[PDB]
Protein backbone atom coordinates (compact mmCIF):
# COMPACT_ATOMS: atom_id res chain seq x y z
CA UNK A 1 0.00 0.00 0.00
CA UNK A 2 1.16 3.48 1.03
CA UNK A 3 4.12 2.21 3.09
CA UNK A 4 6.89 2.31 0.45
CA UNK A 5 5.64 5.46 -1.36
CA UNK A 6 5.39 7.51 1.88
CA UNK A 7 8.99 7.26 3.15
CA UNK A 8 10.55 9.24 0.28
CA UNK A 9 7.90 11.95 0.79
CA UNK A 10 8.19 12.22 4.62
CA UNK A 11 12.03 12.39 4.39
CA UNK A 12 11.93 15.18 1.79
CA UNK A 13 9.35 17.04 3.88
CA UNK A 14 11.67 17.00 6.89
CA UNK A 15 14.52 18.29 4.73
CA UNK A 16 12.40 21.21 3.49
CA UNK A 17 11.53 22.21 7.07
CA UNK A 18 15.20 21.90 8.12
CA UNK A 19 16.25 24.27 5.33
CA UNK A 20 13.56 26.78 6.32
CA UNK A 21 14.60 26.58 9.99
CA UNK A 22 18.14 27.45 8.90
CA UNK A 23 17.08 30.24 6.55
CA UNK A 24 14.71 32.25 8.78
CA UNK A 25 17.31 33.17 11.46
CA UNK A 26 19.69 34.22 8.64
CA UNK A 27 17.06 36.75 7.58
CA UNK A 28 15.92 37.87 11.02
CA UNK A 29 19.44 38.78 12.17
CA UNK A 30 19.21 41.79 9.82
CA UNK A 31 15.93 42.96 11.38
CA UNK A 32 16.22 45.57 14.16
CA UNK A 33 18.26 44.33 17.12
CA UNK A 34 17.30 44.64 20.75
CA UNK A 35 19.29 47.82 21.21
CA UNK A 36 17.33 49.49 18.39
CA UNK A 37 13.87 48.20 19.33
CA UNK A 38 14.32 49.69 22.82
CA UNK A 39 15.05 53.34 21.89
CA UNK A 40 12.59 55.42 23.92
CA UNK A 41 11.37 58.99 24.27
CA UNK A 42 13.52 62.07 24.69
CA UNK A 43 12.89 65.54 26.17
CA UNK A 44 13.81 68.88 24.55
CA UNK A 45 14.22 72.12 26.47
CA UNK A 46 12.46 74.88 24.52
CA UNK A 47 12.58 77.94 26.81
CA UNK A 48 15.38 79.32 24.60
CA UNK A 49 13.34 79.15 21.35
CA UNK A 50 12.16 82.58 20.16
CA UNK A 51 9.46 82.95 17.51
CA UNK A 52 10.91 82.44 14.04
CA UNK A 53 13.50 79.88 15.22
CA UNK A 54 13.47 76.22 14.21
CA UNK A 55 15.24 73.84 16.58
CA UNK A 56 16.43 70.59 14.88
CA UNK A 57 16.94 67.51 17.07
CA UNK A 58 17.90 63.89 16.31
CA UNK A 59 15.35 61.22 17.19
CA UNK A 60 15.51 57.63 15.98
CA UNK A 61 18.38 58.57 13.67
CA UNK A 62 16.23 61.15 11.85
CA UNK A 63 15.69 64.91 12.25
CA UNK A 64 12.84 66.43 14.26
CA UNK A 65 11.86 70.06 13.54
CA UNK A 66 10.67 72.27 16.41
CA UNK A 67 9.66 75.67 15.06
CA UNK A 68 8.20 78.33 17.31
CA UNK A 69 6.07 79.99 14.67
CA UNK A 70 5.78 83.75 14.30
CA UNK A 71 2.54 85.65 13.71
CA UNK A 72 3.13 85.62 9.92
CA UNK A 73 3.63 81.82 9.88
CA UNK A 74 0.35 81.29 11.81
CA UNK A 75 -1.74 83.69 9.69
CA UNK A 76 -0.59 81.99 6.48
CA UNK A 77 -1.45 78.55 7.87
CA UNK A 78 -5.02 79.33 8.82
CA UNK A 79 -5.59 81.17 5.52
CA UNK A 80 -5.05 77.97 3.47
CA UNK A 81 -8.31 76.30 2.51
CA UNK A 82 -8.60 72.50 2.87
CA UNK A 83 -9.44 71.97 -0.83
CA UNK A 84 -6.14 73.67 -1.75
CA UNK A 85 -4.01 71.11 0.11
CA UNK A 86 -2.32 68.13 -1.53
CA UNK A 87 -2.82 66.02 1.62
CA UNK A 88 -5.78 66.85 3.93
CA UNK A 89 -4.80 64.33 6.65
CA UNK A 90 -3.13 65.66 9.81
CA UNK A 91 -0.53 62.80 9.84
CA UNK A 92 -0.62 63.25 13.60
CA UNK A 93 0.14 60.44 16.04
CA UNK A 94 -1.33 62.45 18.94
CA UNK A 95 -4.89 62.56 17.53
CA UNK A 96 -7.27 60.50 15.40
CA UNK A 97 -5.66 58.96 12.35
CA UNK A 98 -8.45 60.42 10.16
CA UNK A 99 -8.28 63.97 11.56
CA UNK A 100 -8.18 66.79 9.02
CA UNK A 101 -5.06 68.94 8.35
CA UNK A 102 -6.37 72.24 9.63
CA UNK A 103 -3.68 74.51 11.09
CA UNK A 104 -5.08 73.90 14.61
CA UNK A 105 -4.48 70.12 14.18
CA UNK A 106 -0.80 70.68 13.13
CA UNK A 107 0.44 72.40 16.34
CA UNK A 108 0.78 71.27 19.96
CA UNK A 109 -0.99 74.32 21.46
CA UNK A 110 -4.29 76.01 20.71
CA UNK A 111 -2.49 79.28 19.92
CA UNK A 112 -0.61 77.42 17.16
CA UNK A 113 2.82 78.78 18.14
CA UNK A 114 4.68 75.42 18.53
CA UNK A 115 5.11 73.28 15.35
CA UNK A 116 6.75 69.86 16.06
CA UNK A 117 7.14 67.40 13.17
CA UNK A 118 9.47 64.82 11.61
CA UNK A 119 11.95 66.62 9.44
CA UNK A 120 11.83 63.77 6.91
CA UNK A 121 10.58 64.54 3.41
CA UNK A 122 7.80 62.15 2.52
CA UNK A 123 9.13 61.59 -1.05
CA UNK A 124 12.42 59.75 -0.39
CA UNK A 125 13.47 60.85 3.09
CA UNK A 126 15.67 63.92 2.65
CA UNK A 127 15.71 66.94 5.03
CA UNK A 128 13.80 70.04 3.83
CA UNK A 129 15.45 73.46 4.24
CA UNK A 130 13.58 75.80 6.59
CA UNK A 131 13.92 79.46 7.49
CA UNK A 132 10.92 80.41 5.35
CA UNK A 133 12.05 78.73 2.11
CA UNK A 134 10.13 77.74 -1.00
CA UNK A 135 7.07 79.36 -2.57
CA UNK A 136 4.72 78.91 0.43
CA UNK A 137 6.71 80.54 3.27
CA UNK A 138 7.77 77.21 4.82
CA UNK A 139 10.24 74.49 3.83
CA UNK A 140 11.93 73.52 0.54
CA UNK A 141 13.30 70.02 -0.09
CA UNK A 142 16.46 70.21 -2.28
CA UNK A 143 16.50 66.53 -3.27
CA UNK A 144 13.65 66.61 -5.79
CA UNK A 145 11.94 69.97 -5.08
CA UNK A 146 9.02 69.67 -2.64
CA UNK A 147 7.55 72.84 -1.09
CA UNK A 148 5.84 72.79 2.32
CA UNK A 149 3.88 75.71 3.78
CA UNK A 150 4.11 77.43 7.21
CA UNK A 151 2.25 74.54 8.96
CA UNK A 152 4.37 71.79 7.32
CA UNK A 153 1.65 70.76 4.81
CA UNK A 154 2.67 69.59 1.34
CA UNK A 155 1.70 71.99 -1.45
CA UNK A 156 4.01 71.30 -4.44
CA UNK A 157 6.49 68.62 -5.64
CA UNK A 158 6.82 64.80 -5.58
CA UNK A 159 6.05 64.31 -1.85
CA UNK A 160 2.61 62.67 -1.31
CA UNK A 161 1.92 63.61 2.31
CA UNK A 162 2.35 66.22 4.99
CA UNK A 163 5.45 65.83 7.15
CA UNK A 164 4.41 63.32 9.84
CA UNK A 165 4.01 64.61 13.39
CA UNK A 166 5.46 62.33 16.12
CA UNK A 167 4.01 61.74 19.51
CA UNK A 168 4.80 65.05 21.26
CA UNK A 169 3.47 66.88 24.33
CA UNK A 170 4.61 69.52 26.79
CA UNK A 171 5.50 67.61 29.97
CA UNK A 172 5.78 70.92 31.86
CA UNK A 173 6.03 74.66 31.12
CA UNK A 174 9.27 74.42 29.10
CA UNK A 175 9.84 70.78 27.99
CA UNK A 176 8.49 68.76 25.02
CA UNK A 177 8.54 64.94 25.17
CA UNK A 178 9.05 63.30 21.75
CA UNK A 179 7.93 59.71 21.15
Amino acid sequence: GTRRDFLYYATAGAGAVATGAAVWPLINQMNPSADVQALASIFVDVSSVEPGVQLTVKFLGKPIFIRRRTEADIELGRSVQLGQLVDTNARNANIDAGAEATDQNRTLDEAGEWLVMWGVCTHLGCVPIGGVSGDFGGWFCPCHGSHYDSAGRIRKGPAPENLPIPLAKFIDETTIQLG
Binding site: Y8, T11, V17, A34, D35, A38, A40, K58
Partner: protein, 256 residues
Protein backbone atom coordinates in the same frame (compact mmCIF):
# COMPACT_ATOMS: atom_id res chain seq x y z
CA UNK B 1 49.08 30.46 39.08
CA UNK B 2 46.90 27.38 38.75
CA UNK B 3 43.52 25.81 39.31
CA UNK B 4 41.97 25.00 42.66
CA UNK B 5 39.07 23.50 44.57
CA UNK B 6 35.58 25.03 44.23
CA UNK B 7 32.36 24.20 46.08
CA UNK B 8 30.02 22.23 43.74
CA UNK B 9 26.81 24.28 44.06
CA UNK B 10 23.66 22.71 42.48
CA UNK B 11 22.46 25.68 40.47
CA UNK B 12 19.03 25.48 38.88
CA UNK B 13 20.38 26.56 35.48
CA UNK B 14 22.72 23.54 35.17
CA UNK B 15 21.85 20.44 33.16
CA UNK B 16 20.29 20.30 29.67
CA UNK B 17 16.87 21.20 31.08
CA UNK B 18 18.32 23.65 33.58
CA UNK B 19 16.75 27.09 33.81
CA UNK B 20 17.19 30.24 35.88
CA UNK B 21 15.17 30.77 39.09
CA UNK B 22 13.55 34.17 38.65
CA UNK B 23 13.48 35.13 42.35
CA UNK B 24 17.13 34.17 42.87
CA UNK B 25 18.17 36.44 39.96
CA UNK B 26 16.23 39.31 41.51
CA UNK B 27 17.93 38.76 44.87
CA UNK B 28 21.31 38.57 43.13
CA UNK B 29 20.55 41.85 41.38
CA UNK B 30 19.96 43.37 44.80
CA UNK B 31 23.25 41.95 46.07
CA UNK B 32 25.11 43.29 43.04
CA UNK B 33 23.42 46.68 43.44
CA UNK B 34 23.88 47.02 47.17
CA UNK B 35 27.34 45.41 47.58
CA UNK B 36 29.35 44.57 44.46
CA UNK B 37 28.41 47.71 42.47
CA UNK B 38 30.42 49.90 44.88
CA UNK B 39 33.57 48.61 43.19
CA UNK B 40 32.48 46.39 40.23
CA UNK B 41 30.77 47.45 37.03
CA UNK B 42 28.96 45.58 34.25
CA UNK B 43 29.82 47.71 31.24
CA UNK B 44 28.49 45.23 28.63
CA UNK B 45 25.09 44.57 30.28
CA UNK B 46 22.26 46.86 29.07
CA UNK B 47 20.15 47.89 32.02
CA UNK B 48 16.97 47.33 29.93
CA UNK B 49 17.71 43.60 30.01
CA UNK B 50 16.43 43.40 33.58
CA UNK B 51 12.94 43.39 31.95
CA UNK B 52 13.75 40.99 29.08
CA UNK B 53 12.32 37.45 29.37
CA UNK B 54 14.64 34.83 30.74
CA UNK B 55 16.16 36.99 33.46
CA UNK B 56 14.98 38.80 36.58
CA UNK B 57 12.00 39.94 34.46
CA UNK B 58 11.27 43.13 36.37
CA UNK B 59 8.40 45.40 35.26
CA UNK B 60 9.65 47.98 32.79
CA UNK B 61 8.60 50.74 35.16
CA UNK B 62 10.77 49.32 37.95
CA UNK B 63 13.70 49.09 35.54
CA UNK B 64 13.09 52.66 34.48
CA UNK B 65 13.24 53.63 38.13
CA UNK B 66 16.31 51.42 38.75
CA UNK B 67 18.29 53.05 35.90
CA UNK B 68 17.84 56.55 37.39
CA UNK B 69 20.29 55.92 40.26
CA UNK B 70 23.20 55.88 37.79
CA UNK B 71 24.63 59.21 36.57
CA UNK B 72 25.27 58.82 32.84
CA UNK B 73 26.95 61.26 30.44
CA UNK B 74 24.54 61.70 27.50
CA UNK B 75 26.11 60.89 24.13
CA UNK B 76 24.59 63.75 22.07
CA UNK B 77 24.27 66.39 24.85
CA UNK B 78 27.56 65.72 26.62
CA UNK B 79 25.90 66.89 29.87
CA UNK B 80 25.09 64.58 32.79
CA UNK B 81 21.67 62.97 33.26
CA UNK B 82 19.71 60.29 35.10
CA UNK B 83 20.20 56.80 33.74
CA UNK B 84 17.85 55.17 31.25
CA UNK B 85 17.17 51.45 30.59
CA UNK B 86 18.97 51.81 27.23
CA UNK B 87 22.23 52.57 29.08
CA UNK B 88 24.68 50.00 30.26
CA UNK B 89 25.63 49.52 33.88
CA UNK B 90 28.59 51.76 34.66
CA UNK B 91 32.21 50.74 34.46
CA UNK B 92 33.88 49.51 37.65
CA UNK B 93 34.25 52.41 40.07
CA UNK B 94 37.41 50.81 41.48
CA UNK B 95 40.11 50.74 38.80
CA UNK B 96 41.51 47.30 39.67
CA UNK B 97 38.07 45.76 40.35
CA UNK B 98 37.36 43.67 37.22
CA UNK B 99 34.17 44.03 35.26
CA UNK B 100 31.66 41.34 36.23
CA UNK B 101 29.63 41.31 32.98
CA UNK B 102 31.31 38.10 31.79
CA UNK B 103 32.95 36.96 35.02
CA UNK B 104 30.80 33.86 35.22
CA UNK B 105 32.33 32.78 31.90
CA UNK B 106 35.84 34.26 32.24
CA UNK B 107 36.70 31.94 35.16
CA UNK B 108 36.86 28.13 35.27
CA UNK B 109 36.16 26.32 38.51
CA UNK B 110 36.63 22.76 37.20
CA UNK B 111 39.93 21.59 35.73
CA UNK B 112 41.68 18.39 35.04
CA UNK B 113 42.24 15.79 35.96
CA UNK B 114 45.40 15.18 33.89
CA UNK B 115 44.51 18.17 31.73
CA UNK B 116 42.21 15.79 29.85
CA UNK B 117 39.21 18.09 30.24
CA UNK B 118 37.00 15.28 31.50
CA UNK B 119 36.10 17.23 34.66
CA UNK B 120 34.58 20.14 32.79
CA UNK B 121 32.86 17.74 30.42
CA UNK B 122 30.66 16.47 33.25
CA UNK B 123 30.66 19.31 35.76
CA UNK B 124 30.83 22.30 33.38
CA UNK B 125 33.34 25.13 33.20
CA UNK B 126 32.48 26.21 36.72
CA UNK B 127 32.54 29.99 36.71
CA UNK B 128 29.60 30.66 39.06
CA UNK B 129 30.92 27.91 41.32
CA UNK B 130 34.27 29.72 41.30
CA UNK B 131 32.66 33.10 42.15
CA UNK B 132 30.77 31.46 44.98
CA UNK B 133 33.98 29.92 46.29
CA UNK B 134 35.77 33.28 46.40
CA UNK B 135 32.87 35.01 48.18
CA UNK B 136 32.74 32.13 50.65
CA UNK B 137 36.46 31.40 50.83
CA UNK B 138 37.48 34.17 53.22
CA UNK B 139 38.57 32.58 56.53
CA UNK B 140 38.58 34.66 59.69
CA UNK B 141 42.18 33.67 60.53
CA UNK B 142 44.89 33.40 57.85
CA UNK B 143 46.97 30.26 57.47
CA UNK B 144 49.40 29.70 60.31
CA UNK B 145 52.38 30.15 57.99
CA UNK B 146 51.71 33.88 57.65
CA UNK B 147 50.59 34.87 61.13
CA UNK B 148 52.06 38.32 60.76
CA UNK B 149 53.39 38.13 57.18
CA UNK B 150 50.21 39.11 55.26
CA UNK B 151 50.80 41.60 52.40
CA UNK B 152 49.15 44.89 53.32
CA UNK B 153 46.02 45.61 51.34
CA UNK B 154 45.55 41.91 50.45
CA UNK B 155 43.43 39.17 52.04
CA UNK B 156 43.74 35.41 52.19
CA UNK B 157 41.11 33.63 50.13
CA UNK B 158 40.91 29.81 49.83
CA UNK B 159 39.85 29.77 46.16
CA UNK B 160 41.86 32.66 44.70
CA UNK B 161 44.91 31.22 42.96
CA UNK B 162 46.47 34.24 41.24
CA UNK B 163 47.53 36.10 44.35
CA UNK B 164 50.88 36.67 46.00
CA UNK B 165 51.97 34.46 48.86
CA UNK B 166 54.45 35.30 51.64
CA UNK B 167 57.88 33.67 51.46
CA UNK B 168 57.08 31.85 54.74
CA UNK B 169 54.17 30.11 52.91
CA UNK B 170 56.37 28.49 50.22
CA UNK B 171 58.22 25.15 50.46
CA UNK B 172 61.96 24.55 49.82
CA UNK B 173 61.49 24.59 45.99
CA UNK B 174 59.22 27.70 46.18
CA UNK B 175 55.81 26.11 45.66
CA UNK B 176 53.09 27.63 47.84
CA UNK B 177 51.78 25.65 50.80
CA UNK B 178 48.43 27.43 51.16
CA UNK B 179 45.20 26.25 49.57
CA UNK B 180 44.59 29.69 48.05
CA UNK B 181 46.42 32.99 47.89
CA UNK B 182 46.09 36.66 48.69
CA UNK B 183 43.45 38.67 46.86
CA UNK B 184 43.09 42.44 46.77
CA UNK B 185 39.32 42.20 47.41
CA UNK B 186 38.33 42.54 51.12
CA UNK B 187 35.50 40.20 52.19
CA UNK B 188 32.52 41.94 50.62
CA UNK B 189 29.73 39.89 52.22
CA UNK B 190 28.52 39.34 55.79
CA UNK B 191 25.37 37.73 57.21
CA UNK B 192 22.24 39.78 56.46
CA UNK B 193 24.15 42.63 54.81
CA UNK B 194 21.15 42.76 52.42
CA UNK B 195 17.47 42.83 53.44
CA UNK B 196 15.50 40.71 50.91
CA UNK B 197 11.85 41.74 50.43
CA UNK B 198 10.35 38.19 50.33
CA UNK B 199 12.16 37.28 53.58
CA UNK B 200 14.58 34.91 51.78
CA UNK B 201 17.65 34.05 53.82
CA UNK B 202 20.68 36.36 53.46
CA UNK B 203 23.57 34.34 54.94
CA UNK B 204 26.93 34.72 53.19
CA UNK B 205 26.16 31.32 51.65
CA UNK B 206 22.74 32.42 50.43
CA UNK B 207 23.84 35.77 49.03
CA UNK B 208 26.88 34.16 47.37
CA UNK B 209 24.72 31.62 45.59
CA UNK B 210 22.11 34.25 44.66
CA UNK B 211 24.62 36.75 43.31
CA UNK B 212 26.56 33.98 41.58
CA UNK B 213 23.38 33.00 39.76
CA UNK B 214 22.61 36.60 38.82
CA UNK B 215 26.13 37.00 37.46
CA UNK B 216 25.68 33.84 35.38
CA UNK B 217 22.62 35.43 33.78
CA UNK B 218 24.46 38.70 33.26
CA UNK B 219 27.16 36.78 31.33
CA UNK B 220 24.84 34.41 29.44
CA UNK B 221 21.50 36.20 29.23
CA UNK B 222 20.36 33.92 26.39
CA UNK B 223 21.11 30.65 28.23
CA UNK B 224 17.46 29.55 28.21
CA UNK B 225 16.96 30.46 24.53
CA UNK B 226 20.09 28.52 23.62
CA UNK B 227 18.85 25.35 25.32
CA UNK B 228 15.35 25.58 23.79
CA UNK B 229 17.06 25.81 20.41
CA UNK B 230 19.34 22.91 21.25
CA UNK B 231 16.41 20.73 22.27
CA UNK B 232 14.48 21.68 19.14
CA UNK B 233 17.36 20.92 16.79
CA UNK B 234 18.04 17.68 18.61
CA UNK B 235 14.45 16.50 18.49
CA UNK B 236 14.26 17.47 14.82
CA UNK B 237 17.53 15.75 13.94
CA UNK B 238 16.51 12.59 15.78
CA UNK B 239 13.43 12.35 13.56
CA UNK B 240 15.40 13.39 10.50
CA UNK B 241 18.11 10.79 11.15
CA UNK B 242 15.56 7.99 11.55
CA UNK B 243 13.82 8.89 8.32
CA UNK B 244 17.13 9.16 6.51
CA UNK B 245 18.17 5.84 8.02
CA UNK B 246 15.11 4.00 6.79
CA UNK B 247 15.50 5.62 3.35
CA UNK B 248 19.17 4.57 3.19
CA UNK B 249 18.31 1.06 4.32
CA UNK B 250 15.37 0.57 1.93
CA UNK B 251 17.47 1.91 -0.99
CA UNK B 252 20.51 -0.38 -0.66
CA UNK B 253 18.21 -3.43 -0.44
CA UNK B 254 18.29 -3.69 -4.25
CA UNK B 255 22.09 -3.95 -4.22
CA UNK B 256 23.13 -6.39 -1.46
Amino acid sequence: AGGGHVEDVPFSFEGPFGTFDQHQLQRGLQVYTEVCAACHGMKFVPIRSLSEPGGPELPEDQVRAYATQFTVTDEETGEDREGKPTDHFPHSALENAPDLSLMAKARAGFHGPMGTGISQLFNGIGGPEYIYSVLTGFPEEPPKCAEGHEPDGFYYNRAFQNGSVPDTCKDANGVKTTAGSWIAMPPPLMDDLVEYADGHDASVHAMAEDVSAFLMWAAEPKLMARKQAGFTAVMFLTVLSVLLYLTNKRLWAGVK
